[PDB]
């Protein structure tokens, strides 16, 4: 079959071009982001609603007196909040690994900051218990949330005072997980075929 | 500015569809290829004419009488003989690491064989500008060959009896060359930005 030489449309995935806390100053390449004053978020270009999923960040400063909460969220997500502050976000932070969701901290991991490769998996399996777990430098941290609300989940950021993360939606990741099988987020750029 | 967020088309990077010795058993998702008899070939769909580029295979089994010789064709090269056996294309091969081309051997490096991870490297003028180097698990083996015939080049796999490898156009390899910088084949595949979108 000649059906695999088919041209494809592709679209990059990217932090989101206008779905943006507009305080927050992100890269000409869309890739990196740096955060101002009071916690604010961003989502991603793209979202996932069933398979499962990863992607990664890497935490290129974070001086003292700042910080970072890092996961997913449905797009009703507040953008002018930290990631986990209501129902539609979990959340892992950076200071004390605790991880949030609807506002309520509990214990997860150790704390994370500089230099660290934190890796993202999120897994919504269809008509299967859902699960969302993270990682830190290719090491897995458990088990944060089982049987999240259903919906569309967009990688996301929030960031306090001015540190700097890097993400990294794939297909090329520092830590590929070795425990599990996904798809990288870049695989949602995927588009229609094109006939010839 | 909303332009790196436009599509754009993309083909991929494969053994390719027709231009291949019919002998070769080649895999459903075109990236792997069995040998059968004697030495016989087969090209990747896309090849270059300018630039740097890179792409890996890997030795997944080489029984002890199999053998291959691996490296870049143009397209006249021989579908029925061994890689680097006429003036089109240039080889390295499995057995005591010879590199060959008009059918001629030379020595090179060590051997290869099952297991590891082979890099191919080429520089195309654009700017001894020509070169080809080869890398086995990520270390370097030297330059092959400088100042090569002017065409177009694609990847190239000539294997011996049943011996079976797997080709990698990128964009993630195992072993990314440290020295150099390149392209991976696998960029050959994009072509125009377009809206749709």
């Known amino acids: ?95 004390k690994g605790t991880k949030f969701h609807q506002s309520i901290g509990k214990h997860y991991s150790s704390g994370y900051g500089q230099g660290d490769v934190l890796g993202f998996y999120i897994n919504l399996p269809e008509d299967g218990s859902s699960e969302i777990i993270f990682y830190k430098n290719g090491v897995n941290q458990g088990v944060a949330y089982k049987d999240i609300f259903e919906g569309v989940y967009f990688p996301a950021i929030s960031l306090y005072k001015s540190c700097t993360v890097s993400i990294n939606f794939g297909p090329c990741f520092k830590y590929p997980p070795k425990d599990l099988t996904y798809r990288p987020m870049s695989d949602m750029g995927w588009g229609a075929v094109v006939e010839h």
């Open 1 to 95: 079959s000649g059906d695999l030489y088919r041209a494809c449309l592709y679209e990059r995935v990217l932090l989101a071009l206008h779905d943006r806390a507009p305080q927050l100053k992100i890269s000409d390449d869309r890739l990196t982001v740096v955060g101002e004053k009071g916690y604010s978020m961003v989502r991603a270009s793209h979202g996932v609603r069933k398979g499962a999923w990863y992607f990664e960040i890497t935490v290129d400063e974070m001086p003292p007196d700042t910080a970072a909460r890092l996961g997913w969220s449905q797009p009703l997500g507040n953008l002018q909040a930290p990631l986990g502050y209501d129902k539609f976000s979990y959340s892992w932070r950076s200071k």
